[model samples]
Target: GKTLVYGAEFEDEKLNPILTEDKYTNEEIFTGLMKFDENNIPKPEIADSYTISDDKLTYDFKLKKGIKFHDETELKAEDVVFTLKSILDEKVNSSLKPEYSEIKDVQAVNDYEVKVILKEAFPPLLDKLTIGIIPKHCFNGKDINTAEFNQKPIGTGPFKFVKWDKGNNITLTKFKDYYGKTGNIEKFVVKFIADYNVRAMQLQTGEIDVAYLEPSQVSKIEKLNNVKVYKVDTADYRCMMYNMKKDIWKDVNVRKAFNYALDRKGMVDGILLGYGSEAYSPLQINKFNNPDVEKYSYNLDKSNSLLESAGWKKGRVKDGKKLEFTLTAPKTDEVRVKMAEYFASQFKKIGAEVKVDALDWDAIKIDKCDAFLLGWGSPFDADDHTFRLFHSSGDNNGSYSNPKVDEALYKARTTTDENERKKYYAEFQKELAEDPAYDFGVYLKALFGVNKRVSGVKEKVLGHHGAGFLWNVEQWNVN
Candidate 1:
């Protein structure tokens, strides 16, 4: 039996995708209702087949017969309804609510089937339902979001959750009773190693077999004999969201000035090592990237000029005082922190006073700084990244806002007319580019180093698959 060793940077404080953002890596072991293909099209998973009504208001799902979850409970229609309903609960605090609010009602047609009614005609409704499903037997009467079951999840996928030892490791065993093929290996292990250098070192010494390689380590790690490197284009981007509430950033001219002051190309080339493209607008590199819009340009003099034109006559401000503000980043995200520091020093050349405040991921999430270095990884589609992020309604959650931009995005996503949707989204992007609300930074291509011995591994634009790789681990084998 061959064992696969996966490397994670930090211990998962919460494996609950319903509560936290830990779904990035754990998605493979868990199963979703409707799963996305490599192209981002939604396809059936737990449910065998589904049909839509002529009015486009109701959807009926037929669950696969005799399917059993890892907990040995039969998968039922009520489970699907229960999971979706829980996502909408106010106390649940699911980040997915903004996307799933399209559903008006979900009814259990029978023990084996369900009916879903949409608030409006959503052609991509199935795409949004790609969230991992939970068995009602395990989460029925409890607070699904905070339940301990999420940490020791019982999934219907190729592997079963065996045990998770806090801050050290997580263990999984191959499922003999899985819907698909049983693997030769008895166990799969995921270990959390804090340092990137140590992760690489572990890979080199054969202590770890799979890892998310840093941009700089990609070339060097790919040269190792036992490793295979996979690079996937993603909707994820490393960007700086300005507190538009701040006067200088609130003005279009001053925001554009900040974008011009920084070097986007240098970050893409010098730091990212050519793994990604420089972005001028949000979600522009995915399939939805607009071809008609012009890319953001670099003009140091023009940047300074815009600042002058914005009536920065009074200069910068700090904490109810004038002339200073702080930029924050996650301590573990070295590349992003470095980029923030570069911008801080560059902005200081003028009258702008910028300070760098780096903290752990948890602390950074709670940070109320003026500007933040943030990264977004799209799970469903490019629209998922744009509509949920740029809308003014989204600002309350993301801490950034632009109403005019939000209205355009709303028209883009809600309209069923594909051509009109594309046109409006493109317009939205160009409008924001012309009057900058955000300093669109660089998009980094995610790189993973997997053991060549492990087969059936594939990658899509967003990480490995439309959500995350290993969805088809039943097909994987140690050759």
Candidate 2:
């Protein structure tokens, strides 16, 4: 079969990119109109060529003929229009709706041409357009949310979804009729190996050709001669998100104090084993990163001063309150549990009574928990994670809201000027540093182990989605 087997940590419940955020997996099964090169720059995919409007609000794509889906149906401009329409449909409620929401309309101008009009100029439009395109015919009259086609997807990608043996593995055979070439790979299999140790052993025994390694466990695999460890740098960062719904986080000074009390460097050295660097903001790895922003370094004296200024007295009690708060962490993630414990210890230095609660993710609620040890970052455009996260009208994952942050994000994404975008992105980071919505933590390095026999594998920048190392899987040759 000339298969390149991958040891996946867990199985994806759905394959439709419109319904879920499986960008890493869906990327392989369905090719988008554009794809990113090894340098993280956008290049043409299904759309042979495209043009942007003068207003920077509309795009036109010229598709190549003869490209077929797995079912042998020729891909056309109509399919592209349908895919965008499906993502915008309220009935479908796509998780990716937020990113592509700026698209005002998508229409097939002709059999091989399509037009996409935007509500406003989105500087990161092309990067977001690199979503998997699905066949419109299969989803014509079904509720896309619960469509059977989601389980069995058909797309114009390098690999076709061949078979999915649930709880075991999912196998994909390279499309013989694929328009683009991947050099050597034919069969791509994702083996669902949940245990970290099992994956390491499998990589050594050649049971799996590729396996994503945990940062702490990288040392163990480095000793194996047959396996090569790829320490992929990513923008993944963990933070302590305060629940704004709680009274404790209402005062901006209190939030700022918590941020100052963190020893991010110590955490990176101890927890990440020196694999990652301290993160002052979510866009740590992006080119638009503003490192000049305020660095809330570990200064307990500053934290105590802020707390006192906010009307907290000796014994760290404020208005009959003991400066007590619970930091909730998902027990399933050992790293976050450790981070929660570390943060509790740091906050204790300020005479704060912090409870590190290692509970299940389901048990932690915004109203119940004072703060949560959460992780969020991406290897894509700076707008990808920041807009939806820190903005007032966005996802509000941390129950955080800042009108200034919202304005900065809007100004950044709604413009096409590079310098303007960078300026606004700086403003967004500065706003976070000033208000301190989340106690920003360190960015973690994405680690992976691969067999020595696998060649042509370029471990480019990976994303938080976890399977980004497979971006160049098509170029892989298992000899």
Candidate 3:
């Protein structure tokens, strides 16, 4: 039996470039210029050397030579340039685009050198660059936005694209010619279980080597024999986003009341299955998290006082409608629904009649509601999360926005100085905290179940989905 069998809760989508949502699969099969360290800061990988220009508009990188594609073609600087260009293309529905917009252009300096020119000075360029780079040879002449190869990907990582059975499983074989040959395992399989309970059961029965254990299943799997639990604090923010465009929730007092009214700590400890840190946003968890910013507090009296002061009187009527609100949550994510229900009860105590609208992930995306539970993963940099979610351009989906927040986000992209860019995000967080868009809850961590017999399993920091084990998959062996 293999040392580990990983069970993902959803159908393992095809390894696709341009679609940043497929990060999990990308990390499983590829490598990037920089990766995250244990502290979640960007560190080098395929890139051997890098330097920033004094003006902060240029980023120069020297690519590691002798890298080969999954199809056995030699890697060159042009592939890196191509991947970035495709991601930035407007035709592609790339989650990375909002993050990559700061990058003005990418040019090949030599066979093994490339430089990224920025539209402005921005820090966190390397952090965003940590994502896997694809092989240029396989896709040199193909249109990335609409390519059949998206479902059948090729990369220069340790594993080569082998075969995939739609809606069931994907298999990969080791690429002997990969840079440094870190992918030691000859074979790897990713099974699409599509259900959390089924994944846990498979892990318990030893049918799968590794499984993503959710909070509800954490305790049960932790007690299973021959299985070990691995956990990491993620930079995801799960919260309620009050749409500021709506007249029902437009006032700052109303927004503050909603923000401060929830029992955030209690929910974090009790409902979250003891797996996360309480937060209103991504502001306090990392170096980019602003410490001076105000956080949400559970204060029913305070919420009521704010509401009353904002002209939200008890038994008030507007156009023959009582003061009521609807909260939309993804029905497919059971845990999220449970969280929404918990908030529904909390909002009631503060005199707002709140209703929970549970719909599937697709349905919830189109549903109309005053407020909704929002969960965002900061896979790239802090700006990716801040700008994509709060900028007026993100629409109601991002929840709220302000001119100062927009300016700060805009300035953060081009400023290459780490400390200086952090100052900008810090200011952004401070302004956001004043009349925030989303009621930040807690950052849900990622968990993996490992078989004790396996040894030397290493991790790479914050890849497409989370930290993928593939970067060091070769160094691992069964005891």
Candidate 4:
């Protein structure tokens, strides 16, 4: 079986898993020791089994016996340790550096067993270990950031990187030397299609077998022959993040007023095209999410009253100056651009002046805007979404600080008990509702169109944004 797919717009030519944030490239060219199964539970892949110490500081993993990389090189514990050490290297440009900063030491215990020591007990350590492992032989002394392996990658996955035609397409072939049952789809061609509608047209013409679709394009593909639309609920959500550093938003009442000004339900219905749910928390879809938190309904009068109470008069001025701020999103993402425009329009109705700006993702910064439209979610752990986004000391905190929120987030992260973690997260969500740094928005559904000839695609609460469709590619077959 041969399959052709159109996915993301590539940022660079680098396919190094550690260096690249491209989910499609990561899924095709590499294999992680631990992989999420159908239930989104972390299961063994290259790793056979693992054990944790009593204090949860030390983790020991046993690699699968007789595993071979795409180059037919035998996989070993040294390779695992080398790959992790490479990520820890100061010279390497890896996005995972911050995630793995807590890792104290990594050593190969034996030929097939590896041990990882952490400075502290990080509950999300398992989640971070899902990173794809690289071969030590290929990157023993090379600069991992710009190494040759970044262009032509090697891994122990079912699919192996064949060739990459710059700005055109990437081709992968089934790994015949794979340890487990190889993929039935022999030739996997991933086309680099920049435009969304062009991908749909390619699929309609039978030039491509699979493509991701926007909510508005679903109906168009549904009428086409031999194509099925798969809609799965994703953890992804869009929110209006405020810059607490700004004087206008530093007032908690002003933040609350912004939340009340917009109709989340109406936005989801119109913008998301009835394919999403209004989110009250960043961890909305998780089991740890607290459903009892306050939900701000659309009420312009309440919004105006809050603004008045916070010293803003009818003319939308907070003292003598006019009450105005900018809300922005990346122009490339049509959904965010539309949402930002809608937010600006709604705020204007409440006598608050909001300017909408659409720019590239690299151009948007917290310091440059009063409020920004952004999205975040996690497939594996609730801590991923909350800790980094809410905590006072968090990297992406946006200068928002609350002692109670900080305490709850810390407790939730350090505790090993699931119930205890849930308790802390519940309190955290409740506190967030009382003092919000972000207006909790809508959780959108992921959409993908697949040809009828393909089968064995399973849906999961994915960790990555829109790459869950490829989770079961090894088992996928042509009917």
Candidate 5:
């Protein structure tokens, strides 16, 4: 019986697999109808077989036989229907809702078969249905948002939920009766360690079997004989989300000037220690990425002139309005905190007074702050992060809205043609450059440290914050 101890920066807000987008234990405790392979392409998981309608608007899925949850409940079509409906439900407020909003109806054609009918033919719909199948019996009449079952969720996966230790750690155990490839580990414990130094220290002493290392920390720990480091690459990037609600960022020229003045290369070389790539747009790592947009190369002279044309004089003021603002970042995330400090110091060079506010995540509000150092990316379908982040119909965290951007994003999502989607995405990117919403920066590579005892760590491009670390946990062998 092997026990694996992994280090996490923070505890999950909830243990429900489908509800949480970022969690290592989500894949272990639950299996979806579809799951991405090493190539990041969607493939069958719990789904034994599936067929699409001639019109391409309907999907029929057949669940794998004899699949059982930790609670010993058999998986059925109703559970799949329930999972989709729950996501579409507005009351649940699931982060996955935006992606599945186009889904019209989910029905259990029988106990073993499910029928999903979409309002329109969404080419990426199959990829979006990868949400983990939750046990409908567990919810019963309970609200999914506040359900007690969520605290102790049960699903048809290799690992079973055991116990949570609040802020310290949460534990899971191997389910011997699992229907798929069983997890090699007997026990899996996710320990929440907030301090970066302590996390690295734990990896050194073998207190934790795995830990996501910082780019700078990786070099310092290369000499450890008991550890193996993986410099994993990712699509994740950090950008400054300018609060469009703020009058200072209301001017399109000011936003463009900020992008021009920023040095993405310096950040990649310095803060990231040359382990990342420059990001001109959010879809830099995506397959359908548009590279024709304004790169906004570092030109301080051009930046100053743009602000001047907008009536901003020396000291970065225009008509008694001082060109100054506060950039907020989560104090716990070391990279974002340092990035805010670096960005603030740079803007000051152009006679604009920029203040850096590093505070707790809970205290920093995007609606109230002048700007936020936010991170976003996706390893799956291109539609996953693009439309929802830039579209007005989305969360609109920064209150940023552009008619042209909305038009492009809308067209891209509705069209099923690949070439058509690409053109629309290009239109979106070009429009965003003319009236930029956020200042895109460096796309950081993920750094991870694994104990020598652990094996079967697969190399895959991760999303944000070194997620998908244990995508192949079932294949791991503790030597």
Candidate 6:
């Protein structure tokens, strides 16, 4: 039997796990040493068990024996070490380097054991180690990034890469030598349907077994015959980020004023159709999230008052416009575009002019506009989601700088104590609330439209983007 699924975009030429950032593709072609459960806890996948040193700086992983790659080659500790070293290699330019840069060393203890040593105690190190490991023989001392093996990848996952037909779909076959029990599904194809409506149509016509649905289309898709709609609360949140270099946005009052102007709750109700929750801080819905932090509720009076106090009395006249600035969203993101439209309309009520526009996804750089709507989420790590984006010295695309936020995040990342880290993260969240950076919006829900014929599809509240309903693809089957 076979299963057909829909993806928003076509797969890129490179299938290398280290280089591929899209979770949709990664989840299909690779299996990590550990995979995060629905509750964000790390569970063993490729690695059977692990032990951490008392100092919390060293980790040892025991791999499952008799596991073979899709190509029928036995997996060894040497392959694990080589895979990690390739990511750290400067010549490879692997996107995972930033996550593993703190690693002091990685070594093979034996055929089925590996040791990883970190420079310091980092709690999120386990999350980083979940990266998919690749076979060492494929590279043969060549640069991992540019090697031909990237297009023809090999992994020990249940599914083996079969072929990629660009602009159409990619095919995979069940790995017979998989260490764990394989599913009944034999041939799996990820069909590329770029247009949202096209994917919905395909799902309706029984051409596609599964699809990631947009909020607006969910209700209609649910009403269709032979369809099942699955919804789960996600950690993903949308925000309107400002370019700090832009004089109009540099004022803390202005940022806070915009936050007050927009109705985050209304957006959830109107745009997401009551499928999401209002978000105030970057750490939305996570245990480390500071619930008592200041909530910027919708208030036109507060928005106008702040704008006036910030010296934009009537409005800062530019090109015969008052308190005007451009807000942008990627054309491809329908949800963000609608959110940006709502922002523009709300700002208009406060005598602040916001010109909303759309740009290509790749062209949305911080310097290109006064403000732009963006979304972010993380896989079970508060530090990964907030530290880099809010810290002063961190590479925040918006260039937001705050010394207090930086200090709090620094302490949180350095400490191994869970309670101590929580306190520091709370401080960071509280500081951010007091001194606003962006107009934090709603924490959206993930929706999946699956054919009723498919069974055993366990829904998980994904913490990262492109992690669709296929998390348990290996267990999915058609009647």
Top model by lDDT, which number? Answer: 5
Q: In candidate 5, which residue pairs clash? A: none
Q: Against the true structure, what is each candidate's TM-score?
A: 0.91, 0.96, 0.91, 0.96, 0.96, 0.95
For 1-479, candidate 2 gives per-residue lDDT tens digits of 38888898867888886787765457788988888888777788889999997898879888988889999999998889888888888877878887788899998989899889999888788898888789989976887778888778899888999888889988889888989876687888889887888998898787998887877789888998999888878878889888888787799998888899988999998898888888898787888888888888888889999988987768688888777888888864678889988999988888888888888766677545788887788777888888888866547667788888889888988878889889999888888788877898888887888888888867666677354777877777877
lDDT of 5 by residue, 11-45 (tens): 78877876777756677788888988898888988
lDDT of the candidates, in the order given: 0.71, 0.83, 0.72, 0.81, 0.84, 0.79
> What TM-score does model 4 achieve against the real structure?
0.96
What does candidate 4's lDDT look like per residue over 1-479, in tens digits?
76646555443457776866556766766787887778777788888899999999998898888888888888898888888887778877566676687899998989899899997888878877877888889975776776889889999877899888888878788888776674478888878786888878887887788877888999999998878898888888888888888898888888888899888889888899888888788788888989898878877888888988898987588788789988878875688888988888888887877878888767767656788787788767887767878876536746778899999988888888989999999999999997997887788888888888888888877543475667778788877
Query: Candidate 5's C-alpha lDDT?
Result: 0.84
Runs in model 3 lying further than 4 Å from the true structure = 1-3, 140-142, 181-184, 315-320, 366-368, 377-380, 394-396, 457-474
**Candidate 2 least-lDDT 10 residues:** 459-468
Model 1, range 257-313, lDDT digits (tens) per residue? Answer: 778776778878877878888877675665555766645477777766765566553
**Clash totals for all candidate models:** 3, 0, 14, 0, 0, 0
Question: Per-residue lDDT for 38-112 in model 6, tens only?
Answer: 567778988899999899888899998877887788888888898888788888877667767888889888899
For model 2, how many clashes? 0
Can you list the residue pairs that collide in candidate 1? 316-323, 317-323, 460-464
Better of 1 and 5 by lDDT: 5
lDDT of 3 by residue, 71-161 (tens): 7677788888878887888876687687688789999989899899988776778877877787766665767655667778888666677
Range of the 10 consecutive residues with the lowest summed lDDT in candidate 6: 313-322
